[PDB]
Design a protein around this ligand. Structure first.
Ligand code: D58
Length: 253
């Protein structure tokens, strides 16, 4: 493989675009200097259209190479116009695909714990794929669930129970982050810096002050679904089987 260019760079390491010397086949290579062992272990379990395909891995010295399907459409983050978002049919289409991916992971007892537009890739046909399983874990062993207690994710995307409870159910945490992603796609704005009564924007949402931004930019139909997902009590929060039945979710656009 010839490393053509950087696709992403950070504290975690880097992602390179690699093109095959003879075939001209393009793949993405995640290069990490030794967590990653768990990322590899989780990746080996996955097989679905709405998850970044894992080809395999190779360790050279103390550096890990993860061979992944190349997603030429880039991050969902870059499709979100600041303070605008994107057209409602596009947001709906990406939300459907996001839900399909999350259903798949939850079905095999895996929680992502880092759902955000920067961790959602688009392929050459604009198909959405869940990416970066470095914070992911097993929450169900054999029809038997375990509660989680890890402080994973970026505060604007995290569910409020992470700040309140000693331990919590895995699935409502991913459902909440998907709701934040949906808000960002529809209005191009994160609704609150923190999911706490101490954050004015969070208190405003709980008080139903939807004449304020970002809610004033969102249509009544997706707003009604957002009112069901962004529920503080994880026990009262909408489950994915009920999201699949929502009026806006099933509205042809
Ligand atoms: C998704 C991002 N989450 C934070 C860590 C970095 C990560 N970046 C990437 N990871 C993997 C791939 C892949 N599997 O193809 C790609 S592709 C790409 C891209 C393509 C086109 C334009 C602009 C960017 C970025 C990227």
């Amino acid at each position: 493989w010839d490393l053509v260019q950087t696709l992403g760079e950070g504290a975690y390491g880097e992602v390179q675009l690699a093109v095959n010397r003879v075939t001209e086949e393009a793949v993405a290579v995640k290069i990490v200097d030794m967590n990653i062992k768990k990322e590899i272990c989780i990746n080996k379990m996955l097989n679905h259209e709405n998850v970044v395909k894992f080809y395999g891995h190779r360790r050279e010295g103390n550096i890990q190479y993860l061979f992944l399907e190349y997603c030429s459409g880039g991050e969902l983050f870059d499709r979100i116009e600041p303070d605008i978002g994107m057209p409602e049919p596009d947001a709906q289409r990406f939300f459907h695909q996001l839900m399909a991916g999350v259903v798949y992971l939850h079905g095999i007892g895996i929680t992502h714990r880092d759902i955000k537009p920067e961790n959602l890739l688009l392929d050459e046909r604009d198909n959405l794929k869940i990416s970066d399983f470095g914070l992911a874990t097993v929450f169900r062993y054999n029809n038997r669930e375990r509660l989680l207690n890890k402080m994973c994710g970026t505060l604007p995307y995290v569910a409020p129970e992470l700040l309140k409870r000693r331990e919590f159910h895995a699935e409502p945490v991913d459902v909440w982050s998907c709701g934040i992603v949906l808000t960002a796609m529809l209005a191009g704005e994160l609704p609150w810096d923190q999911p706490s009564d101490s954050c004015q924007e969070y208190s405003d949402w709980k008080e139903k002050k939807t004449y304020l931004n970002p809610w004033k930019k969102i249509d009544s139909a997706p707003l009604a679904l957002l009112h069901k997902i962004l529920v503080e009590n994880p026990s009262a929060r909408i489950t994915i089987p009920d999201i699949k039945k929502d009026r806006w979710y099933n509205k042809p656009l």
